Design a protein around this nucleic acid. Structure first.
Lengths: 44, 54, 119, 109
RNA sequence: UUAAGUUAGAAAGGGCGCACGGUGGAUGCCUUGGCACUAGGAGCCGAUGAAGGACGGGACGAACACCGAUAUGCUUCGGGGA
RNA sequence: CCGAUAGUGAACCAGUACCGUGAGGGAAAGGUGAAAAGCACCCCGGAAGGGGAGUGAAAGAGAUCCUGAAACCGUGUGCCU
RNA sequence: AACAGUGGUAGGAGAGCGUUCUAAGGGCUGUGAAGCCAGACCGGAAGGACUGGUGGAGCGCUUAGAAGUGAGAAUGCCGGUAUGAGUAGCGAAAGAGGGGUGAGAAUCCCCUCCACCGAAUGCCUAAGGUUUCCUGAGGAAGGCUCGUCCGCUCAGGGUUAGU
RNA sequence: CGCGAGCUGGGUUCAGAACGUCGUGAGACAGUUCGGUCCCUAUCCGUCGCGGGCGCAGGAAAUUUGAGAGGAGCUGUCCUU
RNA sequence: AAGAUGAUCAGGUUGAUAGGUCUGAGGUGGAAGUGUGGCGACACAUGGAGCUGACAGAUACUAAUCGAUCGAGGACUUAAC
C-alpha cells in the first residue's frame, strides 16, 4: 500500500531545505556538522 | 525440510552417473551427409528418400 | 486419443481452425511435431468434405475454415480453394492426404519442428 | 599437437561438461557432426572452438587435419560474475552468472 | 563329454597417490599515502561582503585541478634559461 | 610507527557511491614492463576469445597486468573397489 | 656414577621454541634473495636444514634488547568458494501462419487471420521522474530465457506562447 | 496419555473485552464468557513403486522350481433334522 | 491393453502399428436445401433423415525410410568317461 516518501518538491524543500536551516540557531548547527564533515550535498 | 548435513564430494558425483546425456542416432544422407540424424530431414541438403525438399 | 496441446478446449478449436486454413493457402506448414501429427487427423476429414461439394457439405466445412482470401487477383477464399482445386486432384486417392516429414529440433526451445505437406 | 582456448564466454560449466562428454575421444569426422545435433544449446560455443582448433592445426602446423584424435577436453569455471537478484519479504538472494574456459586439445592419431 | 569344485577379471561410476591446469587474491617485497612527534614561524578571515558552495570557462561535449563574462587567465616586479 | 583486512573512514576523483523523508550511517577499490616497446601481419571466429608471427629478460607478463597458496572446480591417471 | 621417581583438570614453579623490529661485525644474493609449491632428512617438542621447480629483489646467523610476539572453536569480522542442485522459482492474462532482416529467430520487423479491456488495459494532464522522446549504429553488461530487439549502450537530434 | 516438517484449534494459557469475587489501586483467579496470522521447495535413514549397471565361468530366447516374503483368516439369520 | 520418464506390449513395407477412407456399431435424435399448408410465429414431406472423440472390420492411401551401435570363442584341480 501507501509508503512514506510520497514525493514533494515543495514540502521537501520547505521542511528540510536551505533557508529553513539557516533559520534557527539549532538549525544552523545542522549546517555546521554538514560543513566540518565536508559533505557535498548540504541539506536536502 | 532443510538438508541436515552437506553432501560430500563423493555423493555429489554419484548422482552425476545417470545425469550424462546421450548420443543422437545418426547416419549419413545417401545424398550428401555428413551426417544426418535418424528418420528426420537433414539441414545439409534437405533430401529425405530422396526428394529435395528444402 | 486426442491431444491436449496445452490449450483450453476452446483454445484448441481456434488453434486447429487456423492451421487447417493455412494448409490451404501455403500447401505446407512447419509447426511443432505434435502440432503436425494432430493436424493430419482433421485435414483428412476436411478434404473429405471437399470431394462431396454439396451445398450441405460446404456448410459443414465453413466451421473449420475461416474467411481468408487465398489467392490474390482471383479473390478466392480458402473455402473456394478446396472445392475448386483440391477436390479436382484427389479423386484418385482414398485417405492419406497429407504426409508428415519430421525436421530437426528448434533452437530457442528444443521443440521438434515438423513439416506437413499435402499429397 | 594443437590447442584452442575459449577464455570467458558466459555459460555455466555444468551446462558444458555435458556437451563435452560426447567429444573426449571422438574424431573430427565424429564430433563436428555430433555437436551440431545434440541440441543442448551450449553446443555451438564449443563447436566454434573445436572447429577453430582444427583450423589452428590447419594453418599453424599442417597436421593432416581430417585425421585428428581429440585428446584433452577439460572445462574450468572462469571469472564468475555475481549479481544480486531481489526477492520477496526483503530477502534479496543471489544469482551466480558463471563463466567457463573451454580447452579442446586436438592431436594426431 | 559330464559331474563335483577353487579363484582371477570386469568399472556405469567412485576411493586414495601423483602429474598438469582453472577461479580465488595471500604470504612476499614495494609505496602514491597515512599515524605519532620535535625545533621554529603562524595563530584569524568578514559590509572594500567572508568560510563554504551553484552556474560557468579549454580548439575537445564528462570529470579532476586552476580560474571568473578580462573566466585553462591579465598586468607589473624579481628568479629562471629551451 | 604502519606497509593496503595495517595505518585517518579515504595511498585509489571519499565523506564519493550507495542506505535514510531527515539529523545521520557510510564502504570497497594499491603494483604490466626498465620504457608501451601495449602484440604490425597471417589463420579460425559475426564479434569478443584464441593459434602462429614479432616486442622485450620474461607474453606462463598481454589488461585484476609481479608473487600466486587453500577451500573449490577440473582432466588424465598407478593401485583398490 | 649409584639409588629412587616420571597419569593428571583448576592452579604454582622451571626450561625452551617461534615471529617482527632495533643495536656489534660477519655473512649470502643476478653464478638468483624473500615467499610459494614438492620430497622418503635431523632434534624432546615448539620446530629447523638440504635438493628440485616457480619466483625476480632482497635476506638470514650469533649475541643481547624492545614487542600490535603464536588461531580451531567469540550464533566473532571481511572476502572467496561449496552444499541443497541443475533443484524450487522463471512474477496472473492466446496466439498462429507466411515473408523479410541477420552468421544465428518462436521471442526482432512487416502483413494477414484470431483473441482480451472497452466507467478500463482508451485520451489529457496533475503529484513525481529528469531524458526514459526521435533517428542512426551496436549488443558484452540490466532484461528472471534467447535475442538482429528495448525504457540497455553509444553518436547526433529533440520542448518556440502578450491570450 | 501413537500420529501438527500428515490436518483441524473447539478449551486451556498472548494482547481486546466483559461478570462474580478479592484488593485502597494497578490488576488478580485451575471461577465463568465472545473474539483471537498453526511457517518449511525432503539432505540422509526409512517406507512404496519404477528404472540403469554388474554378477550368475561363453553369449542368447522361453518356461520354471521354491528356500523365503506377504494377503486372506469375521460371522448372523432361516428351514429341516 | 501399458505409462511420470525410463520400462512393458502391439509393430516396423512377405506391413494392419497408428491416422485417414470406406462398411458398421452405439450416441443425437428429423440436417441443410427444396416444395407444400399457414398473413404470420410454425408444422408437414423428401427421410430413423442429417451429424458423429478415442468403439469395431476391411483398405498401403499416408507416416513406421535409410542405416548405425552392442554382443560370444567358453580358466583350471580332481572323479567317471
Amino acid at each position: 500500500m501507501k509508503r512514506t516518501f510520497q514525493p514533494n518538491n515543495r514540502k521537501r524543500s520547505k521542511v528540510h531545505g536551505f533557508r529553513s536551516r539557516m533559520s534557527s540557531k539549532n538549525g544552523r548547527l545542522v549546517l555546521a556538522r554538514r560543513r566540518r564533515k565536508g559533505r557535498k550535498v548540504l541539506s536536502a | 525440510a532443510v538438508p541436515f548435513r552437506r553432501t560430500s564430494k563423493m555423493k555429489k558425483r554419484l548422482r552425476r552417473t545417470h545425469f550424462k546425456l546421450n548420443v543422437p542416432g545418426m547416419t549419413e544422407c545417401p545424398s550428401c551427409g555428413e551426417m544426418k540424424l535418424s528418420h528426420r530431414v537433414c539441414k545439409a541438403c534437405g533430401s529425405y528418400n530422396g526428394k529435395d525438399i528444402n | 486419443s486426442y491431444r491436449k496441446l496445452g490449450r483450453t478446449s476452446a483454445q484448441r478449436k481456434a488453434m486447429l481452425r487456423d492451421l487447417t486454413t493455412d494448409l490451404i493457402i501455403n500447401e505446407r506448414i512447419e509447426t511443432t511435431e505434435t502440432r503436425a501429427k494432430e493436424l493430419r487427423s482433421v485435414v483428412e476429414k476436411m478434404i473429405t468434405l471437399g470431394k462431396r461439394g454439396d451445398l450441405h457439405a460446404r456448410r459443414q466445412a465453413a466451421a473449420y475454415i475461416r474467411n481468408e482470401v487465398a489467392n490474390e487477383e482471383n479473390n478466392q477464399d480458402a473455402l473456394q480453394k478446396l472445392f475448386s482445386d483440391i477436390a479436382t486432384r484427389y479423386e484418385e486417392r482414398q485417405g492419406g492426404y497429407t504426409r508428415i516429414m519430421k525436421l530437426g529440433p528448434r533452437r530457442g526451445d528444443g521443440a521438434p519442428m515438423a513439416i506437413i505437406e499435402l499429397v | 599437437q594443437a590447442k584452442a582456448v575459449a577464455r570467458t564466454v558466459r555459460i555455466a560449466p555444468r551446462k558444458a561438461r555435458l556437451v563435452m562428454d560426447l567429444i573426449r575421444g571422438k574424431q573430427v569426422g565424429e564430433a563436428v557432426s555430433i555437436l551440431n545435433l545434440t541440441p543442448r544449446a551450449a553446443s555451438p560455443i564449443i563447436e566454434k572452438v573445436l572447429k577453430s582448433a582444427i583450423a589452428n592445426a590447419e594453418h599453424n602446423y599442417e597436421m593432416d587435419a581430417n585425421n585428428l584424435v581429440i585428446s584433452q577436453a577439460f572445462v574450468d569455471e572462469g571469472p564468475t560474475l555475481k549479481r544480486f537478484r531481489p526477492r520477496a519479504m526483503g530477502r534479496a538472494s543471489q544469482i551466480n552468472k558463471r563463466t567457463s574456459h573451454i580447452t579442446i586439445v586436438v592431436s594426431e592419431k
